[model samples]
Target: CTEPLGLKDNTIPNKQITASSYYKTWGLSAFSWFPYYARLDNQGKFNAWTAQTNSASEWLQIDLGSQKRVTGIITQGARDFGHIQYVAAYRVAYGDDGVTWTEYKDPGASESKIFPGNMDNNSHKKNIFETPFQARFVRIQPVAWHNRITLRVELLGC
Candidate 1:
């Protein structure tokens, strides 16, 4: 299912998005950096969701509003101050209750699947799940990044 899951178009809403941390910057008047900025589109988009630190431990989470089958993901990076930032690689996790989450691992393997991400700030990288999963909550954890851990993304489902 390649149908948009409402993230890019804000069908999911800002309230349904959250992140491990928001990187703050002295711009956009006072401070800029919101999890909702991670939306796929650039419609009045302030910027990509920047994490507090460029660490592999940070994550960007999304609440689908209900359990839905996710088949793929399209992710893009960010640019600021003449520097590019993006998640070079990431892992997916999902849960219905939004409390306990499970990683989407490789076929018949215990290791979580490492999905390739954006190669540049403006490049959108799409990764398909061979085995689609259903869940209400989803998290994107950056395994590797260029410049910094930042992302703009969308989910594909019914």
Candidate 2:
């Protein structure tokens, strides 16, 4: 059975986290992993993202409680009528107390491009990233995400 993700402080607005900025922050690997942060609202809608509005941008934030040795985070992109596209690019970030966020999409803080082979490995597509920067929380900037992505993030360390 899946455990309710132990998200840290602050009730994040379930509206998908969009990458408005271009520069990298901490230690983001690439955008191969589409960060689906949207959560299903009470009426089966993801807060602002729903059938009526059709605006499906959401941001699912996690509070790590305290700073731990973070290794990896996996983002599982959704597959529905939302027309989710195979991520052409993406980004990641971190925070100390849910205030100052540091975006990390590249190792050297310089922009670059990477290719996603294909989505044949699994039914629902998935992407991953490894980071050395440790923090108390993590944020994902999904520049290109599909419908409702039921993300299954796996933190690889304490």
Candidate 3:
């Protein structure tokens, strides 16, 4: 039998995650008067608490605090009503010092999994890399989107 790529657990709970940009929802109510983007709540809510935006160039980058072995990522979209804005495609790039990134590729080739998109609400999709890489920073650049560029993600490794 074959072994898994990395540990079978979520490595990003309570970890710090940042983004290139996010959408802000304005309201007079105190409950709705907060920055409704990239809060890292870890809950795929149906309102604006979940991370969401409409930019094709926006990205979500995570810092593992230090260099760690990364196997893959599990990505999900926000539970907006009965649907979710999903990522159609993206490029996985990683770096060690928060600068100078290299695109992840398959061994002996420059091919990788270009996500087609997920339209299911509260759907979690796992993307295991062909090879595990040690990295301190990982960035998911949105290439295309199904409706908008929204994501709730988790990294899998040690």
Candidate 4:
């Protein structure tokens, strides 16, 4: 049976520290303004952040404002065009001062989390760490993308 409870409610406020780049659209219509990085700007809408192109080096970074215990993270695929764009494999790293970073994984293990694509267009997936790690900055590096590296992330922790 599925757990009665879901991932802990978002604790830390949504914030964006840095990213590879944001999708941009300059059109005359109401849908003209498309800032892909706005997906990481803490808004919970389907307007997700996607890189200009697919690359393993592209990443989305979040600054917690100050160091805190990071327990989990929630990632949402975009809700457009079959909702087919998503990240299948990804790695997470943490930093205290936003410079040096440490990967959050079991010792000697390279894999982090691999998520199934959203079955529904409006669903969100959670990555709960086995052990919460202390960090001031969290960076999500997409190792693989279904169509392109698209994401709207929320951090859960104190």
Top of the candidates by TM-score: 1
| Tens-digit lDDT string for candidate 4 (30-57) | 3321322324233443466666568988
TM-score of candidate 3 on Cα atoms, chains taken together = 0.71
- How much lDDT does candidate 4 score? 0.62
Can you tell me which runs of candidate 2 are displaced by over 4 Å? 1-58, 79-89, 105-107, 112-131, 147-150
TM-score of each: 0.94, 0.49, 0.71, 0.71
Sorted on TM-score, best first, the list reads 1, 4, 3, 2
For candidate 3, list the clashing residue pairs, or say none.
Answer: none
Error of 2 at 6 (Å): 5.4
Against the true structure, candidate 4 reaches a TM-score of: 0.71
Poorly placed runs, candidate 4 (over 4 Å): 1-15, 25-46, 81-83, 108-121
What is candidate 3's CA lDDT for residue 85? Answer: 66
Considering only N, C-alpha and C atoms within 3 Å, which residue pairs clash in candidate 1? Answer: none
Candidate 2 lDDT (Cα, 0 to 1): 0.39
Q: Could you report the Cα RMSD, in angstroms, for every candidate shown?
A: 1.7, 10.6, 4.9, 5.4
lDDT of 3 by residue, 95-130 (tens): 988778878877776575465544553566777776
Q: Which stretches in model 3 have alpha-carbon errors above 4 Å?
A: 1-15, 26-41, 44-53, 81-83, 110-113
The better candidate by TM-score, 2 or 4, is: 4
Clashing pairs in 4: 23-36
Candidate 1, 36-132: lDDT as tens digits: 8897855433577888788888989999999999999999888878888889999999999988999998678989999988899887788999999
Shift of residue 118 alpha carbon in model 2, Å = 9.1
Worst 10 residues of 2 by lDDT: 45-54
